[PDB]
């Protein structure tokens, strides 16, 4: 999987590939969407199984419900619960949560990561390749957020045998 | 095990072999049915033990009871429960769920997989071989769903030492 | 251990050897009975320790109590419980359950296995050898159920270092 | 450890050595008693730690309280509980239970073993050596139960680096 | 694999199935012959890869060349070399060597096994099942060597997921 | 990797993908040719590293040099050497060798495999998927060897994360 | 395996059972001789495969050839070679070497063991049980060497699942 | 991670680096703060994930709430709970707790460590290097607490591949 | 750690070193007291973490509260609880408990060990060295309890890399 | 380590960082050069230890000596030797070999990899990140080879905890 | 072990502790010298066993003999041989080689490390602690090389349970 978010200027994008892999060996679906809206202001992308990811999304919605305009706090509360709940701990996933304003990466080790100044966040087997590629373009004139994101996904997914070339795209802002 | 579903035209079929293997070594039964009807509109096939599969079937019936004509939703709710319930998580199985309209694959990793456009879904040690074979025939003139499914089962079960040549067949639509 | 059941004609037999082995290397008892009656219609043989086997027998009696004339259903319910109960899952055993009418094999993987048409079921380290031997004799004129079972036990228990030549015998139907 | 019981004629003996070993390496006590009376009619010897063994003794007393003159049943009920109780299962021990009439060996695998006709039972790292030695003497004129037991302990404990030459002795029956 | 030899009366047979399995998972060929003649008086069947088996056959021919009418000695010399040669020891195979007069089983553990009085020898994942089945029939009137062998192969190969129903047959003697 | 050969009619084809994967994780080259001609009559494809595959190719050329029109024999001699040479045994590869007349698969387990009647052979992580797909089309009117091979490669390489969509093609015949 | 030697008075006996076990689970031969003469004065019994044991026997003959009337030295030289030769070190076996005068046990750890004053030596899975039994009888009036050895083999082989009741016997010294 | 506290004179400092590392191989954030105030008198630094560390911080706040002016006791009570709570035990973290007066190190092994007279405490992969460096400077004229801490962080974080050069600083007192 | 108790004459001493080691690699504190008084008559030393040891101390105080002048009984009850409580079982520690009259060693294996006649008890990585040294001096004229204990601690802590030369001393008694 | 080569236009650059890491955890040198010239036309960079890398360099010089103007062939011959030589196979390294004309990557798996059309090759823990970054810039106006390489090294070495910011640079062309 | 070298000004020192540890557990000698002169200009310290270290010293003397005033080259040639010689590779050691002019660290991974500008090099379990401490003092007025080295050794050896407080000292330059 490769989920990438680039914020540049008045815009932020989120991309994910669509490959589901079994046994680290075979592609079982090449057209699975890994991004979900949860309102007008917030989208989220996931690496991990449908069930794991969705269970964690729902718990996150509850944390946004409780802390309505502190995205970061909700994220942290989610991570806290995730690490202490026996059930949740049996799940593997990583999430990126995106608003017009903030972007957060949350994993099952309990890290809650915001971008450096460059506005770049990524998860998945392909994520680091994407981050690298994006960073190469972040300060180059003519490259808006989307263009950066697309070129980086191409590069990352070409590299990552566990990610494909078919992407979902969200934009905010 | 090999369970295969092919949807072509106004018809969908589901096939499963009948081999039960112990210790990945020996055949203990060559005549076990791996398909269950649960009403007029829905059949389901399983890879895994009688007990594990059935326990998961029953939880799925409950999810259909609660979400009566959203087969996909029921599947997703099942997967959610399966991944978070301590007990269910100790079970190994995979399911394919078939209606006139939809087909879903659900596993214990929490994946919920629908076919690509070709209408093909399969699980079990033989499943991917069957999917490959079916995809070779999906767009070929003269091959309806049943004929495709039978030829692919022959091929896949000939290859998979854990699947046999005796099949159960369901048809819908 | 070797527990074998052969049904031929209007007769069924159940045999078990009497060896208890420790550490997979030394015989601690050569005279342990591995068969138990639980009413007039039903006997049961076990591979596994006295305690594990009996605990599972008692849970099975309860399942027969709840589903009085569906031996098969009780068996399945037992298997279901066995697979989902944390405690039961820590036990190693396999059972064969015999009535005049039905014979079932239940193991800790959650399989519930009925014989093929040949009426033969067996468990234990020696079970598959016994099954093979019995099958060779099932359709031969002059061999009733008991005679088949005895010859197959000789053969299987000669081969299995974990089974001995001393057998308990039940007859029904 | 070596605990040995020999029943011959109108007499039964129980012996245990007195060595406590740590880390399978060093002797921490050479004068620990491994036998306990629990009334006039019943003694018991243990292999395993003081705490484990005693916890299991107490549960056994309760089983004798409930089944007052079925020593064998109590033993079996104890084994049943031991195997299903999460807590008890974390204990390592083996026990021999002796009355004028019966002798039983119970372990943490859930075996409940009575002697063959020769009246010999043993547990511990040294137990099998002792059994062998005792059996050599069981049918020899001039050797009563005690004499057999002592000679066998000498032999077994000389062999077993985890047992010593200092023994506790009980006689009944 | 299943290679079986039955000697009864003035006749001996050797059978082998034809399944080649990769990764203990998939059938790569269902029509591979596992028997070789090496002159008028001697045939040999193998479990193991073409290359391993043949390399060992050739070394065996050399041992027969050197010890021309002591089949048993040749076998033993082969086993001796096989166990001490670094190269040969990296091979996995088992062989059965058959003449009008003698039958020997040789493996990579260095065992050299001749039949018991019943004239039955077998190797391969299926071998023991076959032996069991054959032994059940060895003393039954009407069953010559071939008939026994065929029925046993059916039974064994039906059981062994790593053996198939297509057999090669040699007869001597 | 996916290397596939289909012989139908007076024609045989050989295809290989071009992906090189490191650490089972990342694509390091997407344009590597895995097929080599060695004269006018013989081509060969490999799964494995450039160095391992080539070393084995050269030893195979020598075997053809020595046994000029027994392709099968050369293959077998190669396999024999490969399995007994200490150095060669440290290599991982699989080969398919193709002439107008014969096709062979050789691996590092020492198997030498010829097609069944359907004329199909394949190796690599994607090979079995390709074989399945090809077999589905082998007897269907309109599908010559090349067309079969291309469709099966699409299917297999779409499935195998370790194979790509860029193929080299040889034809003979 | 159980090989036992008892020296009492002006007599020494050597016994071995005849069971060959594969995979530590099935008996492949119940009639294999584990004793070999090598001249008029010296016999030897082995635990381990025919090939390993014989290879080591032959090296021992050479050591006796070089040190003709120091049985003990030959034994030690053999052990020395066995421990330093790469090839020999890959073999599993233990030997007992018997003359009218001396008895030695040699293993693959490089121990060379002579009896205590009681004249008893034993190897194999069953060896220590046999030693224990023999020691119980060594000093009892009426038991000559053979009688002791036979009773101890019964006892040890009854206990050892890897030894049987069929014995070869040599007498000297 | 490197968290360091140096107390010298009427001043104490606490430093932490800002690197978050994934998979022990890649830096995911170089600007994460690892220090938290919890009132006017007490700050705390952590090695471990945001979620684990914060969960443990909150439990510590509760312990300070219950034992208001025994920092050391709270620390010990926290450690006690941490070691006995199933959930907490699944977390990896280490903490340093600092007041004007006391400094404590608490880890998941249940150690509660106060500085030696030199006033130095440190945790993390880099902690022991920092301790070593600080100790070299503790008694040297001209080096106040901050200066010592800064130089030791440079040194330790230069060495530790899992710590970076960007530090957060607290001073008390 | 090294905790040692020597009782000689009308005096008993208890000593412990002060080293705390992390990761079996580094000294984190060289001045940690490992002895605690709990009233006028009883002191106790521990090997293990502050938290584990203290938790177990407190449970021991409760056992003394309940069995006020049976120190041995309290110890045994503690051990019983410790071995059956899920939480306590996750702790590693060993204790020595000392009164004017009795001395006991308790570990997490559930052993409860009293001295031999020589009045010596010790725990920790250095404990057995200390016991050896003390036993060498126990019967030598001029050496009272304290002098013995000090010399043995020197010797043992010089040897044990996990114990240091700084000791806490208690005397009774 | 990060070694990167970018060829763009009539220029090629080769960069390597200078960090040497021990135990995958501490930096032992931050100023080690990982590039070596070997004549006027050819430079080479290495990941791996000085000794391993240099040993392999010297063998490569010999291969260039033997195949003077086929850089690619030398590389392949080196890889061949490296994979078959027992000694060389014990070394861990990867190399990049650069001339004005060709660039090759050689590893210990025996891969020999040339760049895609983009002219980019990289090895080391950081290599794939550098490749990703370089690829993002390869086709952008204003970025010559050096500028691309420098920016990609910054990015990759920022990410790779096993690479640093200090680089050696060669230019050809 | 801790071997440390500090070069400052016109002077270089080399120190080593004297502790030999067995089984990572016990000190077997506290007075072993780990430094050797090999002429007037060169000393060397080692971590590792006497035999390993000395064998490697001798090979190094030969390399200095061959490259008389290129200390660095000799070191590199030694490392080269060490990594390719089968025998040498079975040794564990690390060395520091010191002259008036150069200092080199050589290990069994094949690294050859010279100091950074600060002139500090160290090996052994304690080495990194020493390096850290030394670096803290390197630029501080009043601290010559020896004084730095001594203070760092104190600190490092106090930390490292595998190093002691007794040091050997050489001075040059
Ligand atoms: Mg890809
Ligand atoms: Mg099949
Ligand atoms: Mg048997
Ligand atoms: Mg002893
Ligand atoms: Mg089969
Ligand atoms: Mg693919
Ligand atoms: Mg036996
Ligand atoms: Mg750093
Ligand atoms: Mg010490
Ligand atoms: Mg870095
Ligand atoms: Mg120290």
Swiss-Prot record, chains A, B, C, D, E, F, G, H, I, J, K:
Q: Where is the active site?
A: 1
Main location as per UniProt: mitochondrion
Localization annotation: Mitochondrion matrix, Kinetoplast
Q: Which consequence is recorded for altering residue 34 to A?
A: Strongly impairs peptidase activity
The answer to whether the entry has keyword S-adenosyl-L-methionine is no
**UniProt keyword annotation of Hydrolase present:** yes
GO MF annotations, alphabetized: ATP-dependent peptidase activity; endopeptidase activity; threonine-type endopeptidase activity
Listed under GO biological process in this entry are:
mitochondrial DNA replication; proteolysis involved in protein catabolic process; rolling circle DNA replication
Return the EC number: 3.4.25.2
Superkingdom, natural source: Eukaryota
Q: Which reaction does it catalyse?
A: ATP-dependent cleavage of peptide bonds with broad specificity
GO cellular component, as recorded: ciliary plasm; cytoplasm; HslUV protease complex; kinetoplast; mitochondrial nucleoid; mitochondrion; nuclear lumen; proteasome core complex
Group of enzyme by EC: hydrolase
Instruction: List the keywords (alphabetical).
Output: Hydrolase, Kinetoplast, Mitochondrion, Protease, Threonine protease, Transit peptide
Q: Which family does it belong to?
A: Belongs to the peptidase T1B family. HslV subfamily.
The record describes the protein's role as: Protease subunit of a proteasome-like degradation complex. HslU recognizes protein substrates and unfolds these before guiding them to HslV for hydrolysis. HslV is not believed to degrade folded proteins. The HslVU protease complex functions in mitochondrial DNA replication by regulating DNA helicase PIF2 protein levels.
**How the protein assembles, per its UniProt entry?**
A double ring-shaped homohexamer of HslV is capped on each side by a ring-shaped HslU homohexamer. The assembly of the HslU/HslV complex (HslVU) is dependent on binding of ATP.
What protein name is recorded for this chain? ATP-dependent protease subunit HslV
Origin species, per record, is Trypanosoma brucei brucei (strain 927/4 GUTat10.1)
- Gene that produces this protein: HslV
């Amino acid at each position: 999987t490769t989920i990438l978010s680039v914020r540049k200027g008045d815009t932020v994008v989120l991309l994910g590939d669509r490959q589901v892999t079994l046994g680290e060996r075979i592609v079982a679906k090449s057209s699975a969407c890994k991004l979900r809206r949860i309102n007008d202001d917030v989208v989220i992308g996931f690496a991990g199984s449908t069930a794991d990811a969705i269970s964690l999304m729902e718990k996150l919605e509850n944390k946004i419900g409780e802390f309505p305009n502190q995205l970061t706090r909700a994220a942290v509360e989610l991570a806290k619960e995730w690490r202490t709940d026996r059930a949740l701990r049996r799940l593997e996933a990583s999430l990126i949560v995106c608003s017009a304003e903030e972007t957060l990466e949350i994993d099952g080790q309990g890290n809650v990561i915001t971008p450096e100044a460059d506005g770049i966040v990524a998860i998945g087997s392909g994520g680091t390749f994407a981050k690298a590629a994006a960073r190469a373009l972040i300060d180059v004139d003519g490259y808006d957020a989307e263009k950066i994101a697309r070129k980086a996904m191409r590069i990352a997914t070409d590299i990552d045998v566990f990610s494909n070339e078919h992407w979902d795209v969200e934009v905010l802002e």
